[PDB]
Amino acid sequence: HSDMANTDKKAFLGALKYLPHAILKLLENMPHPWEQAKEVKVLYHTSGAITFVNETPRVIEPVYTAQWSATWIAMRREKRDRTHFKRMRFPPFDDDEPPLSYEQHIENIEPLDPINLPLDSQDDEYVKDWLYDSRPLEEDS
Amino acid sequence: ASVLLPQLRTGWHVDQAIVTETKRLVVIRFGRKNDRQCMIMDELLSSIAERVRNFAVIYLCDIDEVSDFDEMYELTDPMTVMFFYHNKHMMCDFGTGNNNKLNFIVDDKQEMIDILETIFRGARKNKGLVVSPYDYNHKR
Amino acid sequence: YIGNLITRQFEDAYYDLELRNSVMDDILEMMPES
């Protein structure tokens, strides 16, 4: 599609009309600080137009709450620790340029420590094995 | 009015009408028969037409039935009117911004006549643009 | 809005006036004579 750069077919034209919905869907299926990377199902037009997530992200409610709490705690800890915390400049990228990335992302360094607090064995026993996970876990059993 | 004004069947007809009035000015109304605004415009123009008669002429176009002239307005297509003289399109600057076509209803019969008169005058002069005596800037 | 954009080739006191028109039309329908 990129190589092609202007076609203007009918199907392609049609597909576009569902773009804001697609965007919304994408926004909804955002990865959360506990997660490393959201491996998500998708729908896509044959051109490579209108790519949108078709998974609908649902959660165990109290579990979700717990996760959120944990994240909050982690954040607090971080705040306590670091002095000159780096404010992320925005917009993040070069506006004039077109800085996308796929291949690099694919063959990138290891997904570096996402936000999740340390979990002792005595107190918080039965969750730490399945807590900070995608779906999240407690998903097969 | 339906019985009062003369109505057009096809794009060719419209074009002929536009061409073949040498002396008079030609107000076409491009509009969908069953609309409120369009109806109102037609009613207004019915009154005006007889008056202005010796200088202008009024015609009607069912825009759904005759789809030739979506060149005129880029498929905006509300229930509009358009002004013609020696087969030149005649440009009537109101506030509105659409200097091409009056895409809006005016209620003062006399006012309508006056604007038509103005455009006729402009056409006679040779001018393409003409500033309306009135302002508008409400009826977008 | 998007749909509209793509489909760019394809698609109070007036009451009295409406009444007048409608009635006239009806009358016309009634008498489709010579």
Swiss-Prot record, chain A:
Locations listed in the record: Nucleus
Protein purpose: Functions as a scaffold that mediates the ordered assembly of spliceosomal proteins and snRNAs. Required for association of BRR2 with the spliceosomal U5 snRNP, and the subsequent assembly of the U4/U6-U5 tri-snRNP complex. Functions as a scaffold that positions spliceosomal U2, U5 and U6 snRNAs at splice sites on pre-mRNA substrates, so that splicing can occur. Interacts with both the 5' and the 3' splice site, as well as the branch region. Has a role in branch site-3' splice site selection. Associates with the branch site-3' splice 3'-exon region. Also has a role in cell cycle.
Domain description: The MPN (JAB/Mov34) domain has structural similarity with deubiquitinating enzymes, but lacks the residues that would bind the catalytic metal ion.
The protein's assembly and partners: Component of the U4/U6-U5 tri-snRNP complex composed of the U4, U6 and U5 snRNAs and at least PRP3, PRP4, PRP6, PRP8, PRP18, PRP31, PRP38, SNU13, SNU23, SNU66, SNU114, SPP381, SMB1, SMD1, SMD2, SMD3, SMX2, SMX3, LSM2, LSM3, LSM4, LSM5, LSM6, LSM7, LSM8, BRR2 and DIB1.
Note: Present with 468 molecules/cell in log phase SD medium.
Name of this chain's protein: Pre-mRNA-splicing factor 8
Curated annotation (Swiss-Prot), chain B:
Gene3D superfamilies: Glutaredoxin
Entry coiled-coil feature ranges: none
Claim: Acetylation is one of the keywords in the record: yes
Keyword entries, A-Z: Acetylation, mRNA processing, mRNA splicing, Nucleus
Annotated InterPro entries: Dim1, Thioredoxin-like_sf
CDD domains: DIM1 (cd02954)
Localization, UniProt: Nucleus
A Pfam family the protein falls into: DIM1
Superkingdom in the source lineage: Eukaryota
N-acetylalanine carried by residues: A1
GO biological process, one term: mRNA splicing, via spliceosome
GO cellular component: nucleus; spliceosomal complex; U4/U6 x U5 tri-snRNP complex; U5 snRNP
Family recorded in the similarity comment: Belongs to the DIM1 family.
Subunit architecture: Component of the U4/U6-U5 tri-snRNP complex composed of the U4, U6 and U5 snRNAs and at least PRP3, PRP4, PRP6, PRP8, PRP18, PRP31, PRP38, SNU13, SNU23, SNU66, SNU114, SPP381, SMB1, SMD1, SMD2, SMD3, SMX2, SMX3, LSM2, LSM3, LSM4, LSM5, LSM6, LSM7, LSM8, BRR2 and DIB1.
Function per UniProt: Essential role in pre-mRNA splicing. Also essential for entry into mitosis (G2/M progression) as well as for chromosome segregation during mitosis.
Protein name: Spliceosomal protein DIB1
Lineage: Eukaryota, Fungi, Dikarya, Ascomycota, Saccharomycotina
